[PDB]
Amino acid sequence: SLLPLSTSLDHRSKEELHQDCLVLATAKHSADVEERFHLGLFTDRATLYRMIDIEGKGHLENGHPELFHQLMLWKGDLKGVLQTAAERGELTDNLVAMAPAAGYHVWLWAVEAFAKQLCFQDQYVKAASHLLSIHKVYEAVELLKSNHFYREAIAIAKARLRPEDPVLKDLYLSWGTVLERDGHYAVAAKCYLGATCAYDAAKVLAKKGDAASLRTAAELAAIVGEDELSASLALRCAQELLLANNWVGAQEALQLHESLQGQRLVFCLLELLSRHLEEKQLSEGKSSSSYHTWPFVERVTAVWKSIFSLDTPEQYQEAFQKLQNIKYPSATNNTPAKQLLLHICHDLTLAVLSQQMASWDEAVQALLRAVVRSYDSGSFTIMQEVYSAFLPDGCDHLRDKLGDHQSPATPAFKSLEAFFLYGRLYEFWWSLSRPTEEGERMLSTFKELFSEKHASLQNSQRTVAEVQETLAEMIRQHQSLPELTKRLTEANQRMAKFPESIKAWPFPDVLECCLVLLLIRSHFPGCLAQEMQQQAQELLQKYGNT
């Protein structure tokens, strides 16, 4: 198998095996031996060497370089064999294993040469293993790292290098950066943990945005310290867990850091209100609403006393102070229907809380802030049921406590009562349509809703916001005028003359409240609405043409 050409040649016919012997006989006792190279096994070294490198060329021109190198070993030029195979890149486990015959340094050169060759054949782990035998750990780690064999690079670095070697620490960070790039956040968190940088591990887990990922990042943060980070992470998990109406999942995430104690009350009020809402909307419902098993205002106070131990007024203040600091954005018209309700419930929570510690002034301000938020977002039905839940009877039972010119917060009381009548008037309107029992007695109570000062001021803010759109239109088109400045003076100077109270507290659109009353009035002939119809008519003319 290793000398195949001569093996067949000496198996020829006896015709050519007889001239073969006589050529051999003559040689011992010379161009006739040239043709018969197979007689090298019997004559001398020189003809045997010529014999061996004719089986060489023939192990190459057959596709068996492994046999060619084995033949070259017999001649005794092992050092020269490796260099030849190095140039043409046919080094193998067999060749390197025979390398130390020439010498140790020949083996040293052979493995590095074999390592370089194995790289070009996409054999990187094997190449790195050979580099380890040369006692080149840093080169082996660098070679694997540069080819994104991070798992194998770490294993060799972990086993061979010290745990605190900067080479090892960088491997985790380098691998974590790659894994984080393509959405493998969970594993990339472990790489940062291995890199003894725990803070970055929690944040990477948070970057997923998933509810479970948010929770585990919060728990992971708490283990390594990072208490202020854990609270922020747990809160975000709870906010995401109400997006699926998981009211038991949401409240457990708030049990992590115990600085969320203030936010626990909000999610309790948010849950009970949402139960109060979906109940009297479709008279029944089960929409994966995972409720707990625990007068609306007294119903949340009772639950707060039991489920959260909020009985004595000592910690009413701490809950109030911990909650009054947090502010939310302006809550524009477009906003998720679940986050918007949470923002309202935060202001509602302060309202009931202030009601507990006889803080009537802040109670109306917190209530007003909750109503306004809902009104500003256009969610009229939510604004209406807030009054139903928190002011079930009316609004006069708060006037005696503070509204009798007792505190400077009664301007805020007027806004809250004005918004209450706004819903009452709208309701009275839809009652006239398909979806008199209300009685005219109640109709002559919206008189406070028709405030000329609030009507004029909302008219002034209309032109000013309009003026800032006529000019902003013209400068936009660039890429009546003299009176336009004058009309600002008619308004921008006018609303400056009002008391600071008028501009401090919002009001319902008096012009809109004047449309509905006239519009409602169009169903009942022979009413005349006393002076109320005329006053609404007069107000419409004065601020409606503009």
Author numbering: 847 to 875, 884 to 1148, 1155 to 1295, 1346 to 1389, 1430 to 1496
What do the study's own words say?
Gemin5 in the Survival Motor Neuron (SMN) complex serves as the RNA-binding protein to deliver small nuclear RNAs (snRNAs) to the small nuclear ribonucleoprotein Sm complex via its N-terminal WD40 domain. Additionally, the C-terminal region plays an important role in regulating RNA translation by directly binding to viral RNAs and cellular mRNAs. Here, we present the three-dimensional structure of the Gemin5 C-terminal region, which adopts a homodecamer architecture comprised of a dimer of pentamers. By structural analysis, mutagenesis, and RNA-binding assays, we find that the intact pentamer/decamer is critical for the Gemin5 C-terminal region to bind cognate RNA ligands and to regulate mRNA translation.
